[PDB]
Design a protein around this motif. Structure first.
Motif, short mmCIF file in Angstrom:
data_model
loop_
_atom_site.label_atom_id
_atom_site.label_comp_id
_atom_site.label_asym_id
_atom_site.label_seq_id
_atom_site.Cartn_x
_atom_site.Cartn_y
_atom_site.Cartn_z
N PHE B 146 13.06 52.41 33.86
CA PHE B 146 14.52 52.48 33.90
C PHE B 146 14.97 53.93 34.00
O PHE B 146 15.92 54.30 34.66
N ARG B 147 14.28 54.79 33.27
CA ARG B 147 14.68 56.20 33.30
C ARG B 147 14.30 56.89 34.59
O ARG B 147 15.03 57.81 34.99
N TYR B 149 14.03 55.44 37.73
CA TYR B 149 14.69 54.88 38.91
C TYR B 149 16.19 54.70 38.73
O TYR B 149 16.57 53.89 37.88
N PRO B 150 17.01 55.42 39.48
CA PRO B 150 18.42 55.32 39.28
C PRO B 150 18.91 53.89 39.28
O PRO B 150 19.70 53.57 38.38
N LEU B 152 17.43 51.20 38.64
CA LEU B 152 16.95 50.28 37.60
C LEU B 152 17.81 50.62 36.42
O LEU B 152 17.64 51.67 35.83
N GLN B 153 18.85 49.82 36.14
CA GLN B 153 19.82 50.17 35.10
C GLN B 153 19.64 49.48 33.76
O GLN B 153 20.58 49.37 32.94
NA NA Z 1 17.80 53.99 35.89
#
Ligand code: NA
Ligand code: NA
Ligand code: NA
Ligand code: NA
Lengths: 409, 204
Positions: B146-147, B149-150, B152-153
């Motif tokens: 998540f951190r 990949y933009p 992947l929120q």
């Molecule tokens: Na992200």
């Protein structure tokens, strides 16, 4: 330096074929094609002249078209009285790919209505469509998986002079080792290489001879209008020369020259002139407005290298950055310097898993070592600094998958 | 905020949701929720329900909400997590790196899913990291992705609290019960306990 490629004399008629372009367009399932060949002449126009373009499959003529000169009207002042475009319908064409390099022969005849031949020109034609759609690089409608390598023109004894024997040896070894593509790092190659790639079947990235790596910053010249003219020739003349080769699938603007407005202008020039092939360029961050494919050098699989301005993202992450949709094929990856290629399987695994990761070109084919001789006449492999050259970058020139003599690492 | 629509036991899952005769009933579940909850700032996204496949009813309702309340995205995971009825790719139990290529409704690795051809939406898992029992192994792997990949929120862990119920032994002492402990059958035994905290709120 020196006269390192062939020198020849060519005697043409005064009334002659001065250029010709062959294009192949297809229907939805490739079951039908139109071959369109624009032919230009120099000399005195005469009503009796004609151009015939004939397409052959081996000793069988499969299509032909003949016409007098005189293009369609193109603007308020008319058309090109000195050009003509022939259109040949071709049913169920045998398609070209690196897997099955099917080729036909196109013969372009400048002749008279009553049958006299003035002169003829000719080329091998590969029926293939290259297009990017939905974020994927497609060949004949199927997405490619590029098993490529960068190849410089290098011979340990002859320097930068290439010969048929060596070129053939290289293609055979490449094919034997499951490569299907090559990048002409970083300039147009000897003419024969294209003909061999067309015939043996390798996808080719043809690259203009422009590299300004040593400037600070890297785009100092390529962002300067004053150098647009010299740059332009390097790209335009390459396209003019190589546009009819089927092996050429992608054009590249050059290498390590930052990203300058000159790049943007030239990118658009190619797109206008030859819509049949994507244009790539890695400079300035690998995903600029001057490239149809994200084409980094040495970006890693999972690890980011967040350099200012020109970061090298993990390739998996790059694909999905906000608003990005292009395919990604590394222009250079897996630096094969000395004992190397560690981590190579990591790349392959990614390429297979992610549709949009469509492969890359290993850096590079052959070690640029040169032969020297000791007191005894016994030869040895030399590198930078070994000729008294300085400053120099030592062994930096040996990064190949094969030694200079083509023995494998 | 999610509509009270779940038809998981149907075969195939969208049997009712693709059926116009069920459009009215479903429509009231979505519209009445929106009419009641639309002024709450805490609600940021509307959901069409859960595990009811993907049917035309869904598409109709997704559009209804977009029309009446443009202020919040609409999501729905049925039918593959990335249908025309969702503004957000919102899979359940998709893995970080590993694909689960089930026919029709594959669960791609989340990293890969964001970049499939033509895909541009954000991805937030509607359910992930099934906390049943001694679990949450690999949680850190999700967070790292998540951190990095933009798009992947994040996601919603499954789930907060164990659905255990209190029963009393012959001597009147309480004990934690699950599926089948009330004479219920058929039943799904302990599958009702998947939380990060015990039913009394003690943390696992
Ligand atoms: Na992200
Ligand atoms: Na791929
Ligand atoms: Na080098
Ligand atoms: Na459960």
């Amino acid at each position: 330096s020196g006269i390192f490629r062939d020198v020849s004399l060519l005697h043409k008629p005064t009334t002659q074929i001065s250029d010709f372009h062959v294009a192949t367009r297809f229907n939805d399932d490739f079951s039908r094609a139109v071959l369109e060949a624009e032919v230009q002449m120099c000399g005195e126009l005469r009503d009796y002249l004609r151009v015939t373009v004939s397409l052959w499959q081996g000793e069988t003529q499969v299509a032909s078209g003949t016409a007098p000169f005189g293009g369609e009207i193109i603007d308020e002042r008319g058309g090109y009285a000195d050009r003509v475009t022939l259109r040949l319908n071709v049913e169920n064409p045998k398609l070209w790919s690196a897997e099955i390099p099917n080729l036909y022969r196109a013969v372009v005849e400048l002749h008279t209505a009553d049958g006299t031949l003035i002169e003829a020109e000719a080329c091998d034609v590969g029926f293939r469509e290259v297009r990017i759609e939905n974020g994927l690089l497609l060949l004949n409608g199927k997405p490619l998986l590029i098993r490529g390598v960068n190849r410089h023109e290098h011979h340990p004894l002859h320097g930068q002079v290439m010969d048929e024997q060596t070129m053939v040896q290289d293609i055979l070894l490449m094919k034997q080792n499951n490569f299907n593509a090559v990048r002409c790092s970083h300039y147009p190659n000897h003419p024969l290489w294209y003909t061999l790639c067309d015939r043996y079947g390798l996808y080719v990235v043809d690259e203009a001879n422009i590299e300004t790596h040593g400037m600070v910053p890297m785009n100092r010249l390529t962002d300067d209008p004053r150098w647009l003219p010299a740059m332009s020739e390097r790209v335009t003349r390459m396209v003019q020369r190589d546009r009819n080769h089927p092996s050429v699938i992608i054009w590249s603007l050059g290498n390590e020259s930052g990203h300058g407005a000159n790049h943007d202008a030239l990118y658009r020039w190619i797109k206008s002139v030859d819509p049949s092939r994507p244009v790539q360029y890695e400079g300035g961050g690998a995903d600029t407005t001057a490239t149809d494919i994200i084409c980094p050098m040495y970006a890693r699989v999972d690890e980011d290298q967040p350099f200012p301005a020109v970061p090298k993202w993990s390739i998996k992450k790059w694909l999905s950055l906000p608003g990005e949709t292009r395919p990604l094929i590394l222009c250079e990856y897996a630096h094969a310097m000395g004992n190397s290629l560690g981590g190579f399987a990591k790349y392959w695994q990614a390429f297979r898993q992610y549709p949009r990761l469509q492969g890359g070109f290993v850096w590079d084919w052959v070690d640029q070592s040169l032969i020297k001789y000791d007191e005894n006449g016994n030869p040895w492999s030399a590198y930078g600094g070994d000729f008294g050259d300085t400053p120099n970058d030592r062994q930096f020139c040996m990064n190949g998958l094969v030694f200079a003599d083509r023995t494998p690492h």
